[PDB]
Design a protein around this nucleic acid. Structure first.
Ligand SMILES: [Mg+2]
Ligand SMILES: [Zn+2]
Ligand SMILES: [Zn+2]
Lengths: 468, 1202
RNA sequence: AAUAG
């Protein structure tokens, strides 16, 4: 019924109900719960804790930034040193009781659980958060690729029987070798490929010391946590799309269209949802308005002009316009550049620079004068063109130079030709001109001087004199 | 170099192949250094260096490093013009539908996918899902799912089916189509179909599908994945004075596209909610649509100037587009313009050209001659000499222009006589001097007119100017063959004054030895110019066979007539001069000189006539004065009588005897009769005078009144204008058109009062506005005609056809409207002209009918002949010389290579501005209608026979009672259907009434085979048919205007040709315009160029397909040579616009109008243009295949054959 | 737009 994308966007946005305070706190709690599940999943990894420990080891040595290590502390280097020393001590304890007493022994589980509790009271920077997520993601994906290759090669029920615990164990390989079903001849042939596949698997498992069941459980927990956090974040964004529109309504007619401002504000809103904190007690609009404003205005600064102006110069231009408008109100006439310079505490030359670099390009379809069928682009010359008189003069000069050179000794003519590039692709210095017959810079220089002296004689220079 | 232009869809790989790089940022230039930014819209790494043989680094900065790519920057060391040729590309994050293949109705995507456009937009606008792979499910491809339904069936089935939304869905649907399978399915369904609507739909879709299969195009290429980017120098960002920059709107559109694409990529990287991603995809589609065609999808995107941005479609299309502004017409060098004055001393081949203007125009020639003769050592010295204006430069200029023809042009150029070549004569001044005798050709008068001048450079152009375009070659009108250099105004007046006769003038009755002694008597004041004398005249007569008979005899004449005989060329009778010479008489003199003596004699005679006329108009002293307007004394009495009788009629109205309408009508008739009587009395008083003769008596003499002489001679003025000067202005009309009862009873000599002047202004304003608007209407009509007929060239000599048209004198009542001689002059006989009542072949086949054979036809009383026509020509391309006949502008048979279609279109279009039973003879009666034949056997009365004194063959004596111009021409040439067309008999058979079904009635006809054909007739129709009557095919059942299409269907090609020609000629002859019928026949031939196939046969033609007739004829000839079933067709009549748009070449069709439709159809079809017509070769810069270029093209057609 | 043809 309509074609305007604006109206379609409002139809799609209106179908989402607006949140309340309780709803905002509930959604924020769900986001935090998902992030906590992901953090717990990453913590149950032999490679994760040593990385944090060595990062703290470098930080406490006053060699690395503290902000890059951690961003906050969960409360239900005055303090960071104590907590990280506790973390180091408990990691030592867990490594002591990880395998000596038994993996199923209560020590290895209780220590890990309280390590999870300790790590839950940490707020890491999102950068190394994604860094740790990516490694396990890649490992799990490689496991998926190898498993799907194995399934494609073998293709069933026999694997399903022994997928639970013997997916990567050599017992499955031995039992397949023992099997004598009619299709197991080709399966035994493919066992050579499966051998290399599982040999590649062995390195990754010892890198994790978790076999297959543990990594599958960690992957499922992480996937569930990320899905839950993503759903909550999407709900918040869809709730606040209307706030994005209300903010973006005020920056129309500044080089960008309405939907562009809406989309930039939406990106700002997503960034705000990524870093909201409901413990502070403020409502979501208060924090999100700043980020939506920033995104929209940075987008205007970067994409509203055919010739891009840097952000600092954009601010200078805007504040010049504001000061000029206040001074116009103050004195009743346009502010001259020196008065503006004095009020800006900047040089007048800088003011003039800002003044002429703050003009948008004119359109080539703009009519000239009072006409309406005329266009500016119809009156623009091609200043790069060469006049035919100049081309004819160049051809005449070439002919005259050839005739003059023909009246000289072949050696001098060739030397001058090489030294000036006539009838040649490149010009040459005295060295390679000497390289012709006798490599002599002082000699080549003398013969060039002689040639110029003879060409300067009025007897054989009246033809070339007319070209000056 | 190239032999054809090929159009088609562009694949992503092809667009990538065109590209020299990928545009990744919307940056254009730095704001300080003004240098191109890397990976931007102006990147030097993609499009080329900004300075010749340099890089942005400045490291490689000479020709020594040509072709070397700098490692620091990446800019190739080459020329800068490469930035006009190098293209780029954008890798779109999501597929985008092409707006032309989506919304240019009919939609190609919808037609191919057999889904309505609304559904396609719903899928595109992310409102509805569509199934791509149905899988093992009841779902079918192309069936729409709402989000609710999609979620439901996603839970129900899972991954069995794939459903998508957007342009990706349409691309997947188009990619999965099996084109041969669809073609087979439509063919099978067309075999077993009866409804004509579904037949039309399947035939259209089948045409599209098989075009796609044949062309090699893939349907999914209609959805864009890679977007090409125009070279920067075609969308320049250039500095203006003061630091301002001028830019093209394409930069704004491209920046929008790039920004939205980058935002889409960033949103997909951030894993945004689906609503935001859908929004961004909608915006990307909108931006690409705006870049391609702004305003087609919806609200046009506007810039900061609050006006819509100009897109690529606007670049290529429209009156201001590239085709018409820059390709079909151009600004040229070696050209000038100035005001035109009159040179009465010039010769017909000469034009006065200013010295400074010639110096600027012929500058390279002057440089060349200065260098050649050693006056200038170099070209710069020559430039200095020319700038200093030395005398030797003037001598060089004279030697340069000595025999160099120059082309003079005046806008508007309505016909080819608007450009003519002259020999320039250098004159001091700033105004061009134009020969008077050519002004009528140019429609040029000296009230502020300006002319343009062009210098032909090469030898071929100079010889074309001398041989074809020179004014002495063009003295006949190509539209009618009549002379176009006929003298006018003062010339005529002078020739009128010198040849008049006066009673009892000085020197009457004198005997003169010849013209020389008449001149001597005039110069000695012995005899007046108007003295009746006897002069010895030696007259030479050149007969038709060439016999030259010289007779000397004494003739009664005047002094002026002999003095004028002094300049008449030998070979003409003295009777052409022994009369008073008005415009018609001088026209006859020139025509006889051309017909009996040739071209050189005619040119010399015209020059001498114009000299003599000017001289004796000067010597006459003819002047206009207030006493020359003689108002008759009867005017006041007539006005009084009319007023009194009007008062009587008003009294009768007050008595109720007559109604108001009767009163109005009879008052108007009263005043019209009064105006006629006053005009007659004024003319009678002004035309005659009384003189005393030699005997002393009173004799009546024709008046020498200046106004009477001006009007009677035809110099200027008519009867109506003299009426207005010295009689009554008459009844005037209101703005709507009604006539005001009281007329203007004053003339311009007495002066009008305020009311009379206001009434006059009412009509003056209407006339001026009508002229202003009809100018544009006529221009559009002429352009359409030129487009439809531009391909018609005389390609052969004889096509070897026996067909022809039947020609008879035009009878529209009791008198001949036009003679058979005027119709037959210049046409080639198709069937032997046997003498009536005899078997002697008077005129054989294939003989041109000239004046001699026209006299032969007239003498032997021949009524009907048969002649070759362009409509009946059998040539595969163009026409042949015999079917065309005489070239009216040249007088002989038309030459091969003559572009007769352009001549026809110009001939018809030029006069568009001027555009707005009792027997009377003795003979026998013949019935066919009613015809009254004379004793000689010629039909001289053609009368209707509504459904009589004398029966068939009964002789009848004399007196026995046997009992909106220009719109009309445009509607005739557009084959428009009348509002209430005549119902014609579809088939021959017996009429029978029928069941009067409610709403409108039905009738039936029984054919010779007994089959019943049912006809559907509206209620309000005065049927002329009666049951039991065998109405012939084409017989009128209900009266009304006849549709030309019905005429073609039921009567044939000859009938529709005669209908169109007769109606157009009626419109033109009402206004007195003489245009030959062969031009109209050429246009009608271009109207009859398509045929719909009724029987498929075995040839590669589908039933119900509109294809070119020439292709069918060639295929039928080949199949007959192979002895196989030929195709059967019905010829179609198209309007000139539709015929122009349905030509074979897409270059011409795109250049005409509707560029988007033509280009879209050609692209989907994969058309190939062979460049066979004039417009294509004009656009590509090649020689046109007509005239001097004709032979050239023929040679190429040989080399391709070998 | 205004003006000339
Ligand atoms: Mg004029
Ligand atoms: Zn470089
Ligand atoms: Zn022919």
């Amino acid at each position: 019924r309509t074609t305007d994308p604006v109206r379609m966007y409002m139809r799609e946005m209106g179908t989402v109900e607006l949140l309340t305070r309780e709803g905002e706190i509930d959604i924020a709690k769900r986001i935090e719960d998902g992030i906590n599940q992901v953090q717990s999943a990453i913590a149950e990894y032999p490679g994760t804790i040593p990385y944090i420990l060595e990062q703290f080891d470098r930080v406490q040595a006053e060699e690395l930034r503290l902000t890059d290590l951690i961003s906050g502390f969960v409360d239900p280097p005055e303090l960071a040193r104590e907590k990280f020393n506790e973390l180091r001590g408990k990691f030592q304890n867990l490594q002591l009781a990880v395998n000596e007493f038994g993996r199923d022994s209560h020590q290895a589980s209780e220590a890990s659980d309280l390590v999870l509790d300790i790590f839950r009271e940490f707020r890491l920077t999102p950068k190394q958060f994604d860094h740790l997520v990516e490694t396990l993601r890649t490992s799990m994906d490689r496991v998926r690729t190898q498993e799907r290759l194995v399934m494609k090669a073998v293709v069933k029920k026999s694997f399903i029987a022994l997928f639970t615990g013997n997916e990567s164990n050599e017992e499955w390989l031995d039992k397949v070798l023992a099997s004598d079903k009619p299709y197991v001849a080709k399966v035994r042939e493919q066992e050579e490929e499966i051998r290399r596949s599982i040999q590649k698997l062995q390195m990754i498992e010892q890198e994790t010391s978790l076999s297959v069941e543990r990594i599958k459980d960690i992957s499922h927990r992480m996937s569930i946590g990320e899905a839950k956090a993503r759903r909550a974040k999407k709900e918040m964004v869809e709730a606040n799309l209307r706030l994005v529109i209300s903010i973006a309504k005020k920056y129309t007619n500044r080089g960008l269209q309405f939907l562009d401002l809406i989309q930039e504000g939406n990106i700002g809103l997503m960034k705000a949802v990524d870093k909201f904190e409901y413990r502070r007690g403020y409502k979501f609009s208060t924090y999100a308005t700043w980020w939506i404003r920033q995104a929209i205005t940075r987008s205007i600064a970067d994409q509203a002009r055919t010739i891009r102006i840097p952000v600092h110069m954009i601010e200078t231009i805007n504040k010049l316009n504001r000061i000029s408008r206040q001074m116009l109100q103050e004195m009743g006439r346009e502010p001259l550049p020196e008065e503006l310079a004095e009020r800006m505490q900047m040089p007048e030359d800088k003011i003039r620079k800002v003044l002429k670099i703050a003009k948008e390009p004119i359109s080539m379809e703009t009519p000239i004068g009072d006409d309406e069928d005329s266009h500016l682009g119809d009156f623009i010359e091609d200043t790069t063109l060469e006049l035919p008189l100049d081309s004819a003069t160049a051809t005449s000069l070439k002919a005259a130079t050839r005739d003059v050179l023909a009246g000289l000794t072949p050696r001098e003519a060739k030397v001058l030709r090489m030294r000036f590039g006539i009838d040649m692709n490149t010009d040459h210095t005295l060295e390679e001109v000497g390289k012709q017959f006798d490599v002599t810079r002082e000699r080549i220089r003398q013969i060039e001087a002689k040639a110029l002296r003879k060409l300067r004689h009025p007897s054989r220079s009246e033809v070339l004199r007319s070209f000056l | 170099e190239f032999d054809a232009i090929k159009i088609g869809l562009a694949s992503p790989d092809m667009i990538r192949s065109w590209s020299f790089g990928e545009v990744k940022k919307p940056e254009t230039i730095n704001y300080r250094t003004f240098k191109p930014e890397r990976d931007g819209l102006f990147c030097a790494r993609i499009f080329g260096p900004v300075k010749d043989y340099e890089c942005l680094c400045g490291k490689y900065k000479r020709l020594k490093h040509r072709g070397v790519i700098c490692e620091k920057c990446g800019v190739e060391v080459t020329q800068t013009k490469v930035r006009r040729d190098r293209m780029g590309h954008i890798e779109l994050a999501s597929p985008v539908a092409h707006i032309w293949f989506l919304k240019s109705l009919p939609s190609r995507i919808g037609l191919l996918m057999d889904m309505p456009l609304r559904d396609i937009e719903r899928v595109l606008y992310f409102e509805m899902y569509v199934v791509t792979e149905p899988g093992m499910t009841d779902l079918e491809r192309g069936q729409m799912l709402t989000e609710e339904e999609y979620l439901d069936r996603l839970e129900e089935w899972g991954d069995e089916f794939t459903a998508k939304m957007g342009a990706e869905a349409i691309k997947d649907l188009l990619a999965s189509m099996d084109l041969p399978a669809e073609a087979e399915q439509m063919r099978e369904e067309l075999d077993t179909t009866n409804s004509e609507t579904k037949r039309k739909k399947l035939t259209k879709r089948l045409k599209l599908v098989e075009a796609f299969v044949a062309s090699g195009n893939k349907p999914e290429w209609m959805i864009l994945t890679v977007l090409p980017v125009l070279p920067p120098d075609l969308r320049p960002l250039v500095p203006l004075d003061g630091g301002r920059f001028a830019t093209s709107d394409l930069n704004d559109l491209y920046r929008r596209v790039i920004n939205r694409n980058n935002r889409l990529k960033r949103l997909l990287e951030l894993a945004a909610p689906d609503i935001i991603v859908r929004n961004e995809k909608r915006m990307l589609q909108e931006s690409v649509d705006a870049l391609l065609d702004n305003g087609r999808r919806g609200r046009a995107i506007t810039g900061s100037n609050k006006r819509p941005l100009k897109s690529l479609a606007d670049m290529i299309k429209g009156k201001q587009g590239r085709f018409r502004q820059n390709l079909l017409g151009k600004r040229v060098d070696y050209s000038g313009r100035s005001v035109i004055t009159v040179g009465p001393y010039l010769r017909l081949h000469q034009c006065g050209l200013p010295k400074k203007m010639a110096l600027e125009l012929f500058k390279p020639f002057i440089y060349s001659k200065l260098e050649t003769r050693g006056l200038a050592t170099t070209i710069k010295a020559a430039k200095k000499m020319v700038e200093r204006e030395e005398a030797v430069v003037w001598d060089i200029l004279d030697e340069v222009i000595r025999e160099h023809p120059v082309l003079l042009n005046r806008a508007p150029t309505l016909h080819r006589l608007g450009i003519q070549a002259f020999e320039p004569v250098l004159i001091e001044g700033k105004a061009i001097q134009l020969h008077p005798l050519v002004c009528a050709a140019y429609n040029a008068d000296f009230d502020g007119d300006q002319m343009a001048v062009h210098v032909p450079l090469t030898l071929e152009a100079q010889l074309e100017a001398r041989t074809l375009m020179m004014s002495t070659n063009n003295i006949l009108s190509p539209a009618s063959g009549d002379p176009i250099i006929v003298p006018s105004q003062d010339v005529v007046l002078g020739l009128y004054y010198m040849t008049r006769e006066k009673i009892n003038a000085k020197g009457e009755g004198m005997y003169l030895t010849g013209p020389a002694e008449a001149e001597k008597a005039y110069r000695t004041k012995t005899a007046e110019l108007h003295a009746r004398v006897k002069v010895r005249i030696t007259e030479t007569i050149k007969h038709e066979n060439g016999k030259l008979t010289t007779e000397t005899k004494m003739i009664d004449t005047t002094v002026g007539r002999a003095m004028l005989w002094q300049i008449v060329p030998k070979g003409l009778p003295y009777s052409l001069v022994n009369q008073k010479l008005g415009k018609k008489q001088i026209s006859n003199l020139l025509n006889e000189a051309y017909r009996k003596l040739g071209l050189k004699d005619t040119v010399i005679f015209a020059d001498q006539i114009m000299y003599t006329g000017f001289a004796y108009a000067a010597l006459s002293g003819v002047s206009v004065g207030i006493d020359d307007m003689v108002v008759p004394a009867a005017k006041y009495t007539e006005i009084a009588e009319a007023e009194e009788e009007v008062r009587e009629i008003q009294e009768q109205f007050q008595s109720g005897l007559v109604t108001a309408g009767e009163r109005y009508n009879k008052v108007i008739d009263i005043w019209a009769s009064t105006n006629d009587r006053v005009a007659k009395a004024m003319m009678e008083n002004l035309s005659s005078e009384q003189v005393i003769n030699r005997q002393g008596e009173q004799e009546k003499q024709e008046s020498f009144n200046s106004i009477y002489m001006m009007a009677d001679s035809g110099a200027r003025g008519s009867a109506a204008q003299i009426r207005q000067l010295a009689g009554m202005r008459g009844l005037m009309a209101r703005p709507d058109g009604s006539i005001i009862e009281t007329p203007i009873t004053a003339n311009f000599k007495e002066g009008l009062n305020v009311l009379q002047y206001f009434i006059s202004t009412h009509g003056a304003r209407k006339g001026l506005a009508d002229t202003a608007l009809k100018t544009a209407n006529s221009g559009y009509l002429t352009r359409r005609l030129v487009d439809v007929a531009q391909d018609v060239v005389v390609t052969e000599h004889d096509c070897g056809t026996l067909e022809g048209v039947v020609m008879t004198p035009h009878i529209e009542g009791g008198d001949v409207k036009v003679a058979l001689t005027e119709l037959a002059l210049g046409r080639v006989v198709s069937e032997d002209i046997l003498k009536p009542g005899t078997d002697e072949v008077l005129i054989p086949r294939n003989t041109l009918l000239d004046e001699k054979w026209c006299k032969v036809i007239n003498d032997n009383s021949v009524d009907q002949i048969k002649v070759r026509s362009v409509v009946t020509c059998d040539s595969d391309f163009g026409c042949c010389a015999q079917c065309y006949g005489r070239d009216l502008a040249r007088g002989h048979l038309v030459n091969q290579g003559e572009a007769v279609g352009v001549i026809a279109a110009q001939s018809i279009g030029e006069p568009g501005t001027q555009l707005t039973i009792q027997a009377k003879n003795n003979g026998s009666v013949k019935l066919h209608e009613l015809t009254i034949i004379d004793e000689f056997g010629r039909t001289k009365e053609k009368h209707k026979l509504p459904y009589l004194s004398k029966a068939d063959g009964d002789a009848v004596a004399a007196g026995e009672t046997v009992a909106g111009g220009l719109p009309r021409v445009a509607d005739l040439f557009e084959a428009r259907k009348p509002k209430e067309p005549a119902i014609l008999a579809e088939h021959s058979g017996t009429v029978s009434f029928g069941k009067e079904t409610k709403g409108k009635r039905r009738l039936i006809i029984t054919r010779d085979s007994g089959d019943t054909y049912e006809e559907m007739i509206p209620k309000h129709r005065q049927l002329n048919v009666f049951e039991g009557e065998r109405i012939e095919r084409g017989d009128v059942i209900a009266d009304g205007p006849e549709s030309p299409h019905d005429i073609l269907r039921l009567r044939g090609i000859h009938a529709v040709t005669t209908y169109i020609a007769n109606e157009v000629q009626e419109v033109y002859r009402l206004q007195g315009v003489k245009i030959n019928d062969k031009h109209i026949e050429t246009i009608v031939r271009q109207m009859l160029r398509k045929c719909t196939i009724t029987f498929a046969g075995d040839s590669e033609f589908l039933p119900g397909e509109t294809v070119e007739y020439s292709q069918v004829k060639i295929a039928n000839r080949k199949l007959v040579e192979e002895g196989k079933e030929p195709a059967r067709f019905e010829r179609e009549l198209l309007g000139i616009t539709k015929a122009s748009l349905a030509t074979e070449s897409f270059i011409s069709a795109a250049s005409f109008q509707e560029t988007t439709r033509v280009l879209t159809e050609a692209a989907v079809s994969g058309k190939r243009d062979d460049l066979r017509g004039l417009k294509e070769n004009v656009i590509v810069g090649r020689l046109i295949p007509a005239g001097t270029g004709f032979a050239y093209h023929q040679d190429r057609q040989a080399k391709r054959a070998q």
